[PDB]
């Protein structure tokens, strides 16, 4: 039923001849293709700026609101170096800081997004007082919601991302590692406890849930949590990596549909969603990181299968967005490219970019927030700009 959710892929798969128009033998984009990306970015930015005039004033979040637009502009500033982009980011940061709701802790859906993005913007504008004030507030946020879930949009790893985002952008340990360590400990303890209570232990030493479901994917589920627990940034011990995380990863691997896709929740029989939030485009990160950490070929094999599912069924009728759209799906190819150095996957990303360059010409659904980072145009623009330098590309607000 995946076919019903996708457009047929109109593109030929990789060969040397077809790839030459997009990038050279070193994987560096051609000037021509680079400029075509740049031209579309400028075109879409105009539409986005106009569209955001109608966006909800109250939503300051990374996922659907102002801080996510600031994330885009910070990225464009880094890519292009145009000071006007940094100024745009400032405007959006200011809007976002007037929208704190005190209800959530995450980068994507909570107050950590505005605060972490603001800290970085202020730093980039040489505003030490405001940068430091934002960091203080961000650190303190780790109190307003204990017994949170563990997942990306509403839970502990979503807060961890905000901390990592500051540290990466300052290039120094602005948030002490000990802060990250203690959250990591809570996550691991939570997983062991739930697995024990539900007698998963033998097959899966860790287990997590959100909204009373065992979500499997990146946004709300196991694949996102395990991707994080396997990151050197989180400093999980070798002992816990092998005894707790690896067998829990293997359990997720075992949930794979015959197609190579993954169910949204444990026990789901319908093979339908090919999204970052649910399915192969989000689970692929766990597989790739598992390969990097454990070096077992099965993980790489599974990642290849993810890429094939996405190549076939990844041009979504849903639209061009990151959370569940063609641009988010294209990032799966970039992560596999960056692991393998196989230009086939850079090519696939470029062809998905070609699709996005025809934005609005396919009869896609209009997103609920048509201009947002995760549902809308800002995310598509983010992807196009990130593709300019493929080796540095990372799925925003998620990939490390
Ligand atoms: C965490 S996002 C989950 C996502 N939700 C949507 O696609 C809803 C539409 C969204 N609000 C938009 O406007 O893009 C989804 O997978 N929906 C289930 C489905 O497509 O059947
Ligand atoms: Zn989604």
Residue numbers in the entry: 0 to 399
Paper lines:
The addition of the thiol side chain of Cys residues to dehydroalanine and dehydrobutyrine is a process that occurs in all domains of life and is catalyzed by LanC enzymes. In eukarya, the process is intermolecular and involves the addition of the thiol of glutathione to remove electrophilic structures from the proteome, thus preventing dysregulation of cellular processes. The addition of GSH (C-glutathionylation) removes electrophilic Dha/Dhb residues from the proteome. Previous structures of NisC, LanCL1 (23), LanCL2 (20), and the LanC-domain containing CylM all show a characteristic α,α-toroid fold with a zinc ion bound at the top of the barrel by two His residues and a Cys residue.
In this study, we first determined the co-crystal structures of LanCL1 with GSH (to 1.51 Å), and with S-methyl GSH (hereafter MeGSH, to 1.58 Å). The binding poses of both GSH and MeGSH differ from that observed in the prior low-resolution structure of LanCL1 and density for the amide bonds are consistent with their expected planar configuration. LanCL1 residues Arg4 and Lys317 form hydrogen bonds with the Gly-derived portion of GSH, His274 engages the Cys-derived amide carbonyl, and His323, Arg364, Asp367, and Glu374 make hydrogen bonds with the Glu-derived terminus of GSH. The same interactions are present in the structure of LanCL1 bound to MeGSH. Attempts to prevent the reaction in the crystal by using MeGSH during co-crystallization did not result in a ternary complex, likely because the methyl group on MeGSH prevents peptide binding.
